[PDB]
Design a binder for this molecule. Structure first.
Ligand SMILES: Cc1cnc(Cl)nc1-c1ccc(N(Cc2ccc(CNC(=O)C(F)F)cc2)C(=O)c2ccc(O)cc2O)cc1
Ligand SMILES: Cc1cnc(Cl)nc1-c1ccc(N(Cc2ccc(CNC(=O)C(F)F)cc2)C(=O)c2ccc(O)cc2O)cc1
Ligand SMILES: CC(C)c1ccc(COc2ccc(CC(=O)NCCN)cc2Cl)cc1
Ligand SMILES: CC(C)c1ccc(COc2ccc(CC(=O)NCCN)cc2Cl)cc1
Ligand SMILES: [Mg+2]
Ligand SMILES: [Mg+2]
Lengths: 343, 343
């Protein structure tokens, strides 16, 4: 077959980041335009990450975990190749494409738990030294980022071509709302497994406008994933740190709108982490092994979601007291451009 | 002369970090022991940083700014060479040594404003690209760290051999006190140049012991420098951000003692910094150029002081609202070991 050639060809191209502007504009008339873009762009992006996978050392490459996903990405690449010469003006060519994208979405779901298994085999088969950890961290952050960028495109298509929301984007996303729901659901799982649960104090700061509710252009699902992961972490720590005592501090959130950053601090009084152990929480390796630990996207993955549109997600803590966690986003849709790894 | 040989010889040795334990123990009887240690150790440390200076590219090496300090370090090295074969049991050999250390302390004072001039010439003579900034940052952080480690030794000696304080160390340092003084003095300069000034809310958390005042083993001068720099930064931002308005939020500090970290958050509601501009505040380059900006040690240098005994100093902010700044220290004197750059 052709995978390596197909790959080697498309990895000459550089992926094309989009802004929310461009994403929004694809959703006003335009189906066949989305198509001619994506049949080009998906192979580029697929190929680039496939090129980097195949540069991994053979002792990783050859693990069952990796070989399995290398297999998935190959099918997907090809599935989308089929369409490179099909004719855009055919109201049926466009339709078996969309089916084709969904079929590809389903293949790819179990990718997280699969890589973990590779991470795990690697830890027990070669070790957990710091130099290993840098390589794994390096490669997963890129891989997982790439993968998020592909999902973004695919959902954008399938969701539009099956007013208000434009696919997965909400041009009038109400940050407070997303916060309250992540909390209510976290609260739910907390009340179940613990039989106490912190309250929530939201506070807003709209610097420019004094007192408007804080709205933004974003992908609310991403922001929900992020907030959820954090609330879960805060609740666990708050609740267990105070089993012996009665009084249970709330989790406070502040949501601050400046001239370029829209930021979201979440503060717990859960007893905190010593500075030395904090980088650990972001490491795929030091955090994989075999109560409400089964829920949520992971801390490293939450952070990628923020980096994905030029944000970040940082933790800082005070041992003996508790932890702040902050999500940094771009206030301006203009500055919200995809972040993508290269070659 | 011999400088390059002397240098090449001593740069084979690795500097020897000390704990507060070892520092304290030098100060109970022991003068001539401090001497035989220091005549060895100072040359090692002097030599190592001198070796790294001389590995700088000739277009930096040759600037007047650098050549001047390369000259100072050489004299100092030699001044201390004189003593390598003098006889420890001579109650006068020990005495012209101490004089010799002070003489060396005075030579070295204007080193900060001198390097700035090299930084400045370099910025206008070759540029301020990011790759330059990494090199400067790299080299000054090490240089300035080294220099702090030498001063530490020298003061330790001169201060002991001219109960309670043991040189520059206070084995019962009361953190709250150091905080209040840094504030009162900052408040002073603020009241002078601005004619309003925030109040201060200290709060303590002693996790282990419920309610004891929080004491520690530290070098209070370092901690005062640090706190001062921060208070100045917070006050400026708080005061100017609210000129148009009436109400003036206080600066709050929390001082938290855990099982290994003793931490010190200082929170302002000064309007903050956007995430993108924050690394800038730590860069020697982006922060050198030609109201109460004349006071205090610098932000990068404050941070080194914290790293010096395995701590750190971090900033995180929320544009539209304000900034947290945290000093991370080791709670345990056992974990308080000098951090030193290598070869
Ligand atoms: C990483 C993670 C994954 N899943 C779950 Cl349910 N929790 C965590 C997790 C949560 C909190 C922490 N800790 C450390 C921690 C661990 C346990 C406790 C509770 N105390 C005790 O169990 C007792 F032993 F002291 C408190 C704090 C934090 O300080 C913290 C980290 C991230 C965050 O967003 C919020 C945080 O508070 C560490 C890991
Ligand atoms: C770096 C520095 C050096 N010297 C002096 Cl006096 N101040 C600063 C400095 C102080 C505050 C900031 N800003 C940014 C800043 C700048 C100006 C303002 C005031 N607002 C205005 O001037 C108005 F134009 F908006 C507010 C915040 C902060 O957010 C900040 C940084 C560090 C810190 O410890 C505490 C901080 O608050 C930046 C630089
Ligand atoms: C499970 C998956 C995500 C996984 C697991 C583990 C790894 C680890 O990859 C490593 C580990 C060490 C080195 C250093 C070295 O000696 N390099 C020379 C290379 N020949 C390079 C790489 Cl790529 C990556 C990806
Ligand atoms: C003022 C003092 C502190 C100062 C000022 C400026 C610098 C800058 O030093 C640089 C700048 C660029 C490079 C890249 C390069 O091209 N390297 C090849 C080197 N030949 C290396 C170095 Cl050491 C250091 C110290
Ligand atoms: Mg962090
Ligand atoms: Mg920082």
């Amino acid at each position: 077959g052709s995978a390596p050639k197909y790959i080697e060809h498309f990895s000459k191209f550089s992926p094309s980041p989009l802004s929310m502007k461009q994403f929004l504009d694809f959703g006003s008339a335009c189906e066949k335009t989305s198509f001619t873009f994506l049949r080009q762009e998906l192979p580029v992006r697929l190929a680039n990450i496939m090129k980097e996978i195949n540069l991994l050392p053979d002792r990783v490459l050859s693990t069952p975990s990796v070989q399995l996903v290398q297999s998935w990405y190959v099918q997907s690449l090809l599935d989308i190749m089929e369409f490179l010469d099909k004719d855009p003006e055919d109201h049926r060519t466009l339709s078996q494409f969309t089916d084709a994208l969904v079929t590809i979405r389903n293949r790819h779901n179990d990718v997280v738990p699969t890589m973990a298994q590779g991470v795990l085999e690697y830890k027990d088969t070669y070790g957990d030294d710091p130099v290993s950890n840098q390589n794994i961290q390096y490669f997963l952050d890129r891989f997982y980022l790439s993968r998020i960028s592909i999902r973004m495109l695919i959902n954008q298509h399938t969701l539009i071509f099956d007013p208000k929301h434009i696919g997965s984007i909400d041009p009038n996303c109400n940050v407070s709302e997303v916060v309250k729901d992540a909390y209510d659901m976290a609260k739910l799982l907390c009340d179940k497994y613990y039989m106490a649960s912190p309250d929530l104090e939201i506070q807003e700061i709209n610097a420019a406008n004094s007192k408007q509710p804080i709205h933004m252009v974003y992908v609310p699902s991403h922001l929900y994933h992020m907030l959820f992961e954090l609330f879960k972490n805060a609740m666990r720590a708050t609740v267990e740190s105070h089993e012996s005592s009665l009084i249970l501090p709330p989790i406070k959130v502040m949501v601050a709108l400046g001239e370029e950053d829209l930021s979201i601090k979440m503060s717990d009084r859960g007893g905190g982490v010593p500075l030395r152990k904090i980088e650990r929480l972001f490491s795929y390796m030091y955090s994989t092994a075999p109560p409400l630990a089964g829920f949520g996207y992971g801390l490293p993955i939450s952070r990628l979601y923020a980096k994905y549109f030029q944000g970040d997600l940082q933790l800082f803590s005070m041992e003996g007291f508790g932890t702040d966690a902050v999500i940094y986003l771009k206030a301006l849709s203009t500055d919200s451009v995809e972040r993508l790894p290269v070659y």
